[PDB]
Enzyme design. Structure first.
Site, short mmCIF file in Angstrom:
data_model
loop_
_atom_site.label_atom_id
_atom_site.label_comp_id
_atom_site.label_asym_id
_atom_site.label_seq_id
_atom_site.Cartn_x
_atom_site.Cartn_y
_atom_site.Cartn_z
N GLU A 53 0.87 -1.20 0.00
CA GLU A 53 0.00 0.00 0.00
C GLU A 53 0.90 1.24 0.00
O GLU A 53 1.24 1.72 1.10
CB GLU A 53 -0.97 -0.01 1.19
CG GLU A 53 -1.95 -1.17 1.15
CD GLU A 53 -2.85 -1.18 -0.08
OE1 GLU A 53 -2.76 -0.24 -0.89
OE2 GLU A 53 -3.64 -2.14 -0.22
N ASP A 54 1.34 1.66 -1.19
CA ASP A 54 2.15 2.87 -1.36
C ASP A 54 3.46 2.84 -0.59
O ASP A 54 4.21 3.81 -0.66
CB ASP A 54 1.39 4.14 -1.00
CG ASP A 54 0.08 4.24 -1.72
OD1 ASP A 54 0.00 3.76 -2.86
OD2 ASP A 54 -0.87 4.82 -1.14
N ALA A 55 3.77 1.77 0.13
CA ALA A 55 5.02 1.70 0.86
C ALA A 55 6.17 1.53 -0.11
O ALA A 55 5.99 1.18 -1.28
CB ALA A 55 5.00 0.55 1.85
#
Ligand code: MG
Ligand code: ZN
Ligand code: ZN
Ligand code: ZN
Lengths: 138, 1044, 76, 64, 463, 50, 58, 44, 58
Positions: free
Chosen positions: B679-681
């Site tokens: 998640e967008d990491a």
DNA sequence: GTCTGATCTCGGAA
DNA sequence: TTCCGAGATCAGACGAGAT
């Protein structure tokens, strides 16, 4: 290290220790220690008649000879420009030899690079003799 | 045709960004203090009419400060920032009145005109916007408010075509809203002084036009729908036998809570009357004319009140409070400077307290605008410059009338998704001016009013009626000659450049606006299809042999506001010029602000991804000014090794953002790696963070002051308490240094004491300790007196944090991401030439967000470093991909940038090629050390005995009532008793069986018999409910029962 | 005899709720446990071996009741 | 601030190549081939000189 | 903290790791609606032993795999795991016993280290012997020999072949027999959240909930280990239109503009026929939208025909990991008409949307149509209209949560004190009956199968 | 004007020509050094005007 | 189903059956809660906390 | 107690309850001299 | 802000923490990785019951 | 700054 | 004749949480 203006001091002792590179990257003995498989480029079709000098500017400069001969493949950076040509991309398959690579060690200067590699093999051998003596205990 | 961008760096030197804050204040100092004296001379009293106090002028000098009787020394603005003073200058036979704070880079500040060499000795950064007052040490901006226009006939749709003109009295004492309503087909004139919606023909006969033939001739001579004005009202007027002018003042003379000849001046104010009401009637008749012929959010209607217009709202009131109290003194001591010098407190502590606490609390103008000022956000450079160009509202959707004036993509999200805008680059808010030559050319060019028959101003096409600033000034038969002649005159320079003539043909009203506060913008005039710049002019501006203001008088650049843009045919580029082009566009990247505009290729991203960055650009963590080491601010974030971006825009050079950047640019390699980037990491490597990739520097600030009291005792800073040895406490006074203040250059653990501020009750010491979680090193300790000289002492705490797991990075395209994993370098997919990545970015951020502008920065950056060049990716232009891609080929790279890597872990080559290159990753100020929090059991609040709110007060986070229903829906009953009674408010109370009420301890006071009293178990907040219910007359009489 | 012969998830929770809190006050353990120190992990070992000294008192909402041994129920 | 003495990606010693780089830009040398004279082959060590700003000569002014 | 449904509080077992972040498995992030873009989330710790069991049994993640609106599973693969397992179960992959024992032996830590992991026999023997990709995905469903899981599933998939049951070359038809993937590739609809026929829902109903959580925690460990050594990556080569798109988009932008020039001219210069909805200048725009959505979808079909396989945004769209085929047409070919609340963009000026166009222009690219895709970059008027249509997304989420937060509050402040009593009746707190059986049959919507039926008998009989 | 840790970090990245495998690791904390584990350096710079 | 957003009918079969079980359709507002619930603190924890507490003391 | 001026940078030995003015200045921003103790730093 | 809607229902809670989240696929779906510094602060009262006597002594 | 049911005043009618 | 319909004015409320 730093810049100063008059009236300013830097007074400091330092301590140096022997550290693995994986502890912190300031202990790393080498700038880059990468490797790459030696490419080999095979013209499946004979190329001549101005398509050879077309294939010259397509690759890396030193790699080729001009008919077209693949003179020296080791200098090839993989731009992969052949597939832009739409004609020679069916002609030549490009490939890299699996069991023939090219190491490129450039030391920072702590140890000379011919002693970095012979130390690098020496601690892999020590890493497996460390485990083979574990099985001798058990 | 080739080079016309050069007009923008010449416009920005004159009146472009944060210069509209300054000029507005420079207008306020150098004009508006001499227009309040002309309104407020002649201080007279009735108890003695033979004296008089008459102000001649006010001068506002240079900023000074006294520390004793008559030192009167000057001050640099970065001394007021340290000593917590207020940067202000005196207000001034020739005697002082008060002190007024000065915004920086104003005409009377110190910083104007002086070279960067002289900025050093004044300890101020040259790349610093200005436009902020320094009040009580902090630095406040007056935010630009947007109001609707003044005396505007707005035709709304309350029920059916109600129109209300919110007239604002030029004599500023009041602002009234004389709206016009329709009830069951009849027009009315509802006001807030009228006790009744009175019919409009009652007003018309009260206004002097007594006959009914005149009224229709006013409203509509062409009858087709204005005949349906007839049986509406003039019959309804005639239905009661009330044809008389004096008698129809009488119906007004009853409901107004002979006496109404005067009180009809407080109705539709700015139409002026000298008891010749003919001008007033037409303006009411035109207000009715709209309704029978029948946009609140459109930026010809929105005027902007700047910092200098808004202070003149205050100082006129603070001068009057200074003025009227001279009458209250002169009427006290007569049955004069010496009874005035103590009213130097009146202006000075009036003006300063209005800026620090952002409250114009002005009962004299009935306005209570809250939150007009804001403390500057010195997080980065552009978070300061993004505050200078900021507009606060009083709709949320973007209107296309904001084209060229406001940034479309720069907005917050949340409560203010479209309510806090940002000014674009090439805009200019206007100031006021005189209306002399506007009227003088209007009456020559052709206009006539008060002699024309009621019928003329009607459906006839040749009756465009001129309106200036909302007041009718005659009618012109030919609208074109008037609009064209004024426009040629303005271009020639006889009329002020800012005034705008616009024409609405739906209702024939031309509109000359000299308002001041209009959003304006310049364009290149297109006479016939050849433009006017002529290139050679773009060459004059090259050597400087000409200035942007010479373009104006040569009639080559025109200032256009939003209202005039209705009448133009703006061409975007050179190649879209048509048969009827009118104006052209200077440089089309100027429609973006200064927080966007930082983005490279904003015209390739999805538009809700630029807007995410405009928030995160302000949150960036970088360098602040060249004086960033001498500033002692409450929270200052600094990067260790900032780098200017590889793909700069063109707005970055005008701001000089690269002179003081924010964020490194790391060689990312967008690929999916190790599954810790979902998640967008985004995965970093533990070598760049060991090599110093984005080391932080978070600078806190702790302070104390040692005040002398009214008791004439004072505070002491007595040194450490050495115990059993010269060694100080177990760690408590270890860093004190023996002068009290801690020593600079030393680390402070938790609960270690910085100063021993000891207070008189006899001395109880109030030790100022450093809480933190981690350690901090003292960098500077400053010692000074404040204004009321009381020994202030300010600390400055270093802390460096390498960015570990949790620390939020963004990516200059709104694709922010917590750093999920930090792998070692040898586990990471090196390419052929040896380059292992720094920040492996997940490729799933791309196909849903459609930020294609990021994918070109890995191309324009990678070709950029390989050539030794900074590729411009601006908005709507910049370096194209078809020329960047053929620059990778010269350096032996893939012409899309996808480089062949081999994997670090397994050693075999990766199955697919990996995109690879340097993109500008800016660390931003959400590091997990400031947000890690846990509360085991700590302080409870004194009233309700629940855990406190905040991490600064050891926290406890509210299991809210929405999460109560989640715990309900699971059916977990014994959890909710545990989670809302046991571990929040575990109380124990005693009630009695009979008369059931809270009785303390062993027995209940009502019915002293002590026998029935049986303890309960209850939350304390419920016990506090019962005990505050019983305080009023509601008595919860509990009736217990034993556990069954 | 008329309610569901399946142990609901609200009955398994509270039976594990109070048999955990009973066994965390030195109750006699019924399963000759094998080193589990979490009292909750003992209680699921009690449930699967079907040795819990607990009878569920199921209230029909009129006021009548109907008992059910935890031995006499079908867990999931 | 000051030049970081390593490359962030590879770690070539690059802090000793700043005044040698500024000495090259003082001459005719173009921004491109100045870094080819210092032995900066790959681009990741090339951006440490190219994209670097030198605030430390500017902060010093405001630090008596 | 914005708790919107039952699944925002969930229990978790706690393992003390070495950092200051709350780290959880990314399969359970769509119940929390939690991305990792700097989001914070709270952690309560229940104190009594009775409230510890009420967390574990009722609110555990192994219990609440299934949302109570539909019965769909919310905890299932997200993003990379889906595009990992699609790229692994794709028909083309073949692993030798080198890579096969490497991908498989990733699944041996943490309650899994004590199983004799059985590699299946390889599906090519003689010329070279090597495994296939789907045979290694079967190791997720049944790693050991003595594992009792036999999963069965037969379903359609995304990009379904239309004709042919399971034998067509598109290979989007999943058939699992006895936890061995026999044909087809794992889309989102066979692994992700929202479908009642993904395997983790099928492993839940038929084989308990411990085997569904194990097979989901196996895939989260396995699929990145394949993908980080296969290197799925996006680039700008994955967005550049080929030669075939440009000559297709150029004609579609011309022949789509000749007619809209005539359809405008057929209105004002002469007589235009009218659709039954409204008069002229209202059905003109509804006939403008038909021809402009012809453009963006034929060019969207011109893009997808020439777009070569193993393209990265195409692969992320075939399995539904991230972004549909609309986003690929917007990035590459042409992003269509930018609509504001269901119409072309309204004129903010007088009879004109922006002062660049002419007055009363109903032309395309003057009332909101953008012709350039995101690759070739928007132009200044086009960038403004995309911003205007973009803000209506951002504005409406500010105001909807200002209302549905209240509408959540009024709903639960009336409906909270109902529970199905022991004689199957549903009563209020005061004893009064609302329903005689809950919902007619007395059945959980959570456990309810698709079609509002507890069984779906075709699936159980074939199982 | 260079901060203390950033100076102390920039002293870390400087390579040192003394070869290892003459020395040994640092066993305990041992912040004093034993001249068989460590190697001390001094830096004394104080600038004036010429 | 118009907004996508599938939902079980058994949830709507409960919400409707609560909303119309006391004679007439009792919409879930502040006002419909007074005609649905008897207890005060459940009404008092909802809106109109002042009037609902005084009126139930009257 | 030795303090350093605002810009004069002269060491001014003040004492307690003394105005913070300066020798050869009037400027009242007086920083403190750096500490004398051995401060240990870590090169990580 | 009043006692009903915010102090009786939505009340603040002890033994509760809050950090930023970051992914970890290497956990089972049922486990959260809790930092050490938080796990040394948030405490569980575990009573001593003949099976955790040696464990709590240790 | 509206959206709201309630509760007060007017008015026309069997 | 009174009573009920339709005209005015009046209410309490308008999401979580965070620094
Ligand atoms: Mg988020
Ligand atoms: Zn009593
Ligand atoms: Zn490098
Ligand atoms: Zn001095």
């Amino acid at each position: 290290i730093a810049q100063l203006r008059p009236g300013q001091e830097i007074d400091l002792l330092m301590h140096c220790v022997k550290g693995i590179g994986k502890d912190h990257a300031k202990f790393s003995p080498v700038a880059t220690a990468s490797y790459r498989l030696l490419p080999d480029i095979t013209l499946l079709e004979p190329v001549e008649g101005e398509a050879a000098e077309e294939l010259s500017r397509c690759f890396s400069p030193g790699v080729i000879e001009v008919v077209a001969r693949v003179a020296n493949p080791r200098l090839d950076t993989f731009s992969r420009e052949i597939f832009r040509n739409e004609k020679l991309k069916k002609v030549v398959r490009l490939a890299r030899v699996r069991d023939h690579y090219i190491f490129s060690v450039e030391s920072t200067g702590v140890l000379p690079p011919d002693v970095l590699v012979s130390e690098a093999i020496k601690v892999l051998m020590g890493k497996c003799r460390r485990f083979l003596d574990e099985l001798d205990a058990v | 045709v080739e080079e016309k961008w050069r007009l923008l760096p010449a416009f920005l030197k004159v009146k472009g960004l944060v210069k509209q804050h300054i000029d507005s204040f420079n207008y306020f100092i150098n004009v508006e203090i001499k227009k309040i004296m002309k309104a407020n001379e002649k201080v007279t009293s009735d108890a003695d009419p033979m004296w008089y106090l008459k102000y001649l002028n006010i001068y506002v000098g240079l900023p000074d400060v006294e520390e004793s009787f008559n030192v009167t020394r000057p001050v640099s603005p970065h001394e007021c920032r340290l000593r917590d003073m207020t940067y202000s200058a005196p207000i001034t036979n020739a005697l002082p009145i008060g002190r007024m704070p000065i915004m920086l880079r104003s005409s009377n500040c110190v910083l104007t005109g002086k070279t960067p060499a002289e900025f050093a000795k004044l300890n101020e950064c040259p790349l610093d916007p200005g436009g902020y007052f320094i009040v009580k040490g902090v630095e406040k901006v007056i935010l630009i408010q947007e109001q609707l226009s003044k005396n505007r006939i707005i035709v709304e749709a309350d029920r059916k075509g109600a129109v209300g003109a919110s007239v604002t009295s030029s004599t500023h004492e009041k602002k009234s809203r004389t709206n016009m309503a329709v009830k069951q087909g009849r027009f009315y004139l509802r006001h807030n002084t009228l006790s009744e919606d009175i019919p409009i023909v009652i007003i018309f006969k009260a206004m002097g036009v007594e006959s009914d033939q005149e009224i229709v001739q006013m409203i509509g001579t062409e009858e087709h729908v204005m005949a349906a004005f007839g049986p509406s009202l003039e019959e309804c007027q005639k239905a009661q036998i009330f044809t008389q002018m004096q008698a129809l003042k009488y119906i007004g003379n009853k409901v107004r809570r002979a006496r109404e000849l005067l009180a009809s001046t407080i109705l539709t104010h700015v139409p002026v009357k000298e008891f010749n009401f003919r001008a007033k009637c037409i303006y009411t008749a035109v207000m009715v004319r709209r309704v029978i012929l029948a946009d609140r959010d459109y930026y010809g209607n929105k005027r902007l009140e700047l910092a200098g217009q808004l202070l003149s709202l205050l100082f006129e009131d603070l001068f009057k409070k200074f003025n009227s109290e001279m009458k209250k003194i002169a009427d006290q001591v007569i049955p004069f400077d010496v009874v005035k010098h103590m009213r130097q407190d009146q202006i000075t502590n009036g003006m300063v307290n209005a800026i620090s606490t952002g409250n114009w609390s002005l009962k004299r103008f009935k306005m209570d605008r809250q939150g007009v000022t804001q403390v500057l956000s010195r997080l980065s450079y552009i978070s300061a410059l993004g505050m200078m160009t900021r507009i606060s509202s009083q709709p949320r959707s973007l209107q296309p009338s904001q084209w060229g004036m406001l940034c479309p993509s720069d907005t917050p999200e949340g409560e203010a998704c479209g309510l806090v805008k940002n000014l674009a680059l090439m805009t200019h808010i206007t100031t006021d001016m005189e209306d002399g030559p506007i009227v003088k050319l209007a009456s020559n060019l052709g206009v006539e009013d008060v002699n024309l028959l009621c019928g003329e101003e009607l459906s006839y096409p040749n009756v465009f009626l001129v309106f200036l600033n909302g007041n009718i000034l005659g009618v012109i038969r030919d609208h074109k000659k008037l609009v064209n002649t004024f426009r040629l005159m303005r271009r020639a320079g006889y009329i002020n450049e800012f005034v705008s003539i616009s024409t609405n043909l739906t209702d024939r009203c031309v509109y000359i606006s000299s308002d001041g506060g209009r959003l304006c913008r310049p364009y290149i005039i297109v006479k016939k299809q050849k433009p006017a710049v002529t290139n050679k002019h773009m060459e004059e501006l090259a050597q400087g042999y000409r200035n942007f203001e010479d373009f104006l008088h040569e009639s080559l650049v025109e200032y256009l506001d939003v209202n005039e843009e209705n009448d133009c045919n703006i061409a975007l580029y050179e190649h879209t010029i048509n048969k009827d082009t009118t104006h052209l566009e200077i440089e089309p990247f100027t429609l973006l602000g200064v927080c966007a505009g930082l983005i490279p290729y904003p015209h390739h991203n999805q538009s809700p991804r630029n807007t995410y960055q405009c928030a995160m650009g302000k949150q960036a963590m970088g360098t602040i000014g060249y004086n960033q080491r001498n500033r002692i601010d409450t929270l200052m974030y600094l990067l260790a090794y900032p780098q200017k971006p590889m793909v700069k825009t063109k707005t970055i050079e005008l701001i000089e953002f690269e002179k003081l950047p924010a964020g490194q640019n790391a060689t990312v390699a967008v690929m999916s790696y190790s599954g810790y980037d979902i998640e967008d990491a985004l995965v970093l490597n533990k070598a760049s963070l060991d090599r110093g990739f984005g080391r932080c520097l978070v600078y806190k600030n702790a302070k104390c002051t040692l005040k002398r009291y009214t008791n004439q005792t004072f505070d002491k800073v007595m040194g450490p308490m050495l115990d059993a040895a010269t060694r100080k406490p177990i760690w408590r006074h270890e860093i004190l240094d023996a002068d009290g203040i801690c020593s600079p250059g030393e680390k402070v653990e938790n609960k270690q004491v910085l100063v021993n501020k000891s207070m008189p009750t006899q001395y109880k010491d109030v030790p100022i300790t450093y809480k933190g979680a981690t350690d901090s090193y003292i960098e500077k300790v400053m010692i000074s007196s404040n204004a009321e000289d009381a020994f202030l002492i300010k600390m400055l705490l270093r802390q460096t944090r390498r960015p570990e797991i949790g620390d939020k990075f963004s990516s200059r395209h709104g694709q922010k991401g917590v750093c999920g994993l930090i792998v070692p370098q040898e586990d990471m997919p090196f390419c052929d030439s040896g380059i292992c990545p720094d920040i492996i970015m997940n490729p799933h951020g791309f196909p849903s967000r459609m930020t294609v502008g990021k994918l070109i920065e890995l191309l324009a950056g990678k070709a950029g470093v390989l050539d030794g060049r900074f590729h411009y990716g601006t908005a709507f232009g910049g370096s194209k991909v078809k020329d960047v891609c053929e620059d990778l080929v010269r350096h032996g790279y893939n012409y899309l940038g996808k480089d062949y890597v081999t994997s670090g872990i397994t050693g075999e080559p990766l199955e697919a090629y990996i995109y690879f290159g340097p993109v500008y990753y800016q660390k931003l100020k959400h590091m997990v050390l400031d947000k890690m929090h846990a509360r085991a059991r700590g302080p409870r609040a004194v009233l309700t005995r629940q855990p406190t709110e905040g991490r600064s007060r050891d926290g406890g986070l509210r299991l809210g009532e929405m999460e109560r229903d989640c715990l309900i829906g699971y059916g977990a009953s014994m959890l909710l008793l545990e989670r809302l009674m046991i571990s929040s408010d575990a109380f124990e109370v005693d009630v009695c069986g009979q008369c059931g009420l809270l009785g303390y301890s062993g027995w209940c006071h009502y019915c002293k018999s002590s026998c029935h009293v049986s303890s309960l178990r209850i939350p304390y907040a419920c016990k506090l409910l019962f005990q505050e219910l019983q305080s009023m007359n509601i008595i919860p009489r509990l009736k217990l029962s034993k556990y069954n | 005899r008329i309610t569901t012969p399946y142990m609901t998830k609200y009955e398994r929770a509270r039976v594990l709720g109070t048999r955990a809190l009973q066994i965390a006050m030195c109750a006699p353990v019924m399963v000759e446990l094998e080193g589990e120190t979490d009292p909750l992990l003992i209680a699921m070992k009690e449930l699967k071996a079907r040795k819990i000294p607990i009878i569920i008192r199921r209230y029909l909402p009129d006021g009548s009741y109907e008992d059910w041994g935890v031995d006499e129920l079908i867990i999931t | 601030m000051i030049i970081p003495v390593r490359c962030f990606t590879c770690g070539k010693i690059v802090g000793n190549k700043w005044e040698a780089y500024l000495g090259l830009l003082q001459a005719e040398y173009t921004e491109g081939d100045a870094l080819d004279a210092l032995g900066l082959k790959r681009y990741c060590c090339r951006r440490m000189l190219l994209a670097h700003v030198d605030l430390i000569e500017k902060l010093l002014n405001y630090a008596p | 903290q914005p708790s919107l449904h039952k699944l925002s509080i969930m229990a978790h077992l706690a393992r003390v790791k070495p950092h200051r972040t709350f780290r959880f498995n990314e399969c359970v992030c769509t119940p929390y609606n939690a991305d990792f873009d700097g989001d914070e989330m709270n952690l309560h710790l229940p104190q009594t032993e009775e409230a510890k069991a009420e967390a574990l049994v009722l609110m555990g993640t192994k219990a609440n795999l299934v949302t109570p609106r539909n019965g769909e599973p919310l905890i299932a693969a997200i993003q990379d795991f889906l595009t990992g397992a699609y790229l692994l179960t794709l028909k083309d992959t073949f692993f030798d016993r080198a890579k096969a024992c490497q991908i498989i032996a990733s699944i041996l830590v943490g309650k899994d280290e004590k199983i004799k992991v059985r590699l299946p026999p390889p599906t090519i023997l003689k010329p070279v012997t090597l495994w296939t990709g789907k045979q290694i995905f079967s190791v997720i469903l049944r790693p050991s020999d003595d594992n009792p899981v036999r999963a069965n599933l037969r379903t359609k998939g995304k990009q379904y072949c239309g004709k042919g049951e399971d034998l067509c070359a598109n290979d989007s038809y999943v058939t699992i027999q006895n936890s061995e993937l026999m044909s087809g590739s794992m889309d989102k609809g066979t692994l992700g959240s929202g479908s009642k026929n993904n395997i983790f829902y099928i492993l839940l109903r038929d084989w308990g909930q411990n085997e569904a959580a194990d097979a989901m925690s196996r895939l989260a460990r396995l699929a990145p280990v394949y993908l980080s050594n296969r290197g799925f990556s996006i680039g700008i080569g994955d967005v550049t239109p080929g030669q075939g798109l440009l000559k297709a988009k150029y004609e579609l932008l011309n022949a789509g503009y000749k007619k809209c020039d005539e359809y405008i001219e057929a209105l004002n210069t002469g007589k235009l026929q009218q659709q039954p909805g409204c008069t002229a200048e209202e059905t003109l725009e509804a006939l403008i939208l038909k021809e402009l959505s012809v453009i963006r979808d034929h060019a969207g079909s011109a893009c997808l025909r020439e777009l070569d396989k193993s393209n990265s945004p195409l692969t992320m769209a075939l399995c539904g990991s991230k972004g549909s085929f609309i986003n690929i047409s917007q990035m590459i070919a042409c992003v269509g008409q930018q609509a504001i609340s269901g119409s072309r963009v309204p004129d903010g000026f007088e009879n004109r949307s922006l002062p660049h166009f002419e007055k009363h222009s109903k032309l395309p690219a003057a009332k909101g149509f953008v012709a350039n895709s995101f690759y070739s970059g928007l132009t200044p008027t086009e960038f403004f209209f995309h911003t205007m249509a973009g803000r209506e997304g951002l504005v409406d989420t500010a105001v909807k949560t200002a209302e549905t937060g209240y509408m959540q509050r009024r709903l639960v402040k009336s409906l909270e004190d109902l529970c199905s009593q022991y004689d199957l009746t549903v009563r209020s707190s005061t004893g009064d009956i609302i329903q005689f059986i809950y919902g007619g049959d007395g059945l959980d919507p959570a456990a309810m199968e698709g079609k509002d039926e507890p069984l779906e008998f075709k699936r159980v009989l074939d199982n | 004007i260079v901060q203390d840790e950033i100076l102390a970090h920039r002293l870390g990245l400087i390579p040192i020509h003394a070869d290892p495998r003459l020395f040994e690791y640092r066993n305990q904390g041992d912040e004093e050094g034993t001249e068989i584990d460590t190697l001390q350096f001094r830096l004394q710079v104080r600038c004036t005007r010429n | 189903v118009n907004h996508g957003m599938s939902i079980d009918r058994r949830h709507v079969m409960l919400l409707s059956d609560l909303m119309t079980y006391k004679g007439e359709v009792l919409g879930i507002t502040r006002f419909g809660l007074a005609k649905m619930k008897e207890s005060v603190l459940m009404l008092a924890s909802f809106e109109k906390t002042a009037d609902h507490l005084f009126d139930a003391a009257y | 107690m030795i303090y350093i001026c605002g810009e004069c940078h002269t060491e001014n030995e003040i004492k307690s309850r003394d105005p913070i003015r300066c020798r050869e200045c009037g400027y009242r921003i007086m920083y403190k001299k750096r500490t004398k103790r051995l401060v240990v730093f870590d090169a990580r | 802000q009043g006692r009903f809607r915010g102090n009786l229902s939505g009340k603040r809670v002890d033994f509760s923490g809050r950090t930023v989240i970051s992914p970890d696929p290497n956990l089972r779906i049922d486990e959260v990785a809790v930092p050490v510094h938080v796990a040394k602060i948030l405490t569980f009262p575990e009573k001593v019951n003949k099976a955790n006597i040696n464990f709590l002594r240790k």
